[PDB]
Design a protein around this ligand. Structure first.
Ligand SMILES: [Au+3]
Ligand SMILES: [Au+3]
Ligand SMILES: [Au+3]
Ligand SMILES: [Au+3]
Ligand SMILES: [Au+]
Ligand SMILES: [Cl-]
Length: 129
């Protein structure tokens, strides 16, 4: 599913991501925009053989099981395919574990490089929430 910007913002809020670990909703929308262009079915293979899955490009090296990432963990206790669903629940729940792991949203390199310190509120500007 390819979300609209305000559509994603509302789904993220309903699932409790707004101000989760102190990160406003625009942070989460910005991260999703540059991780997946709001496409839930986005996948990208990393050099190290792991894969990133879904709207927030959650990596199989630590967080989900895809059966093809040797020596990896599954800390969200889910199949990576569950992060590709049109329903973002599984991605949100896993993202909450990720952003609580100590480094905040810096876990998402595209957030650090393209969202952090910018006017992230623009991503929710105009949306009915
Ligand atoms: Au904001
Ligand atoms: Au894994
Ligand atoms: Au594996
Ligand atoms: Au923090
Ligand atoms: Au949802
Ligand atoms: Cl949803």
């Amino acid at each position: 599913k390819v979300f609209g910007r305000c559509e994603l913002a509302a789904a993220m809020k309903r699932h409790g991501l707004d101000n989760y670990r102190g990160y406003s909703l625009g942070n989460w929308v910005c991260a999703a925009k540059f991780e997946s262009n709001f496409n839930t079915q986005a996948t990208n293979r990393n050099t190290d053989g792991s894969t990133d899955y879904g709207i927030l490009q959650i990596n199989s090296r630590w967080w989900c099981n895809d059966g093809r990432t040797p020596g990896s963990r599954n800390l969200c206790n889910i199949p990576c395919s569950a992060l590709l669903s049109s329903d973002i629940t599984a991605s949100v729940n896993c993202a909450k574990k990720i952003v609580s792991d100590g480094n905040g949203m810096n876990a998402w390199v595209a957030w650090r490089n393209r969202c952090k310190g910018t006017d992230v509120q623009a991503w929710i500007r105009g949306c009915r929430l």
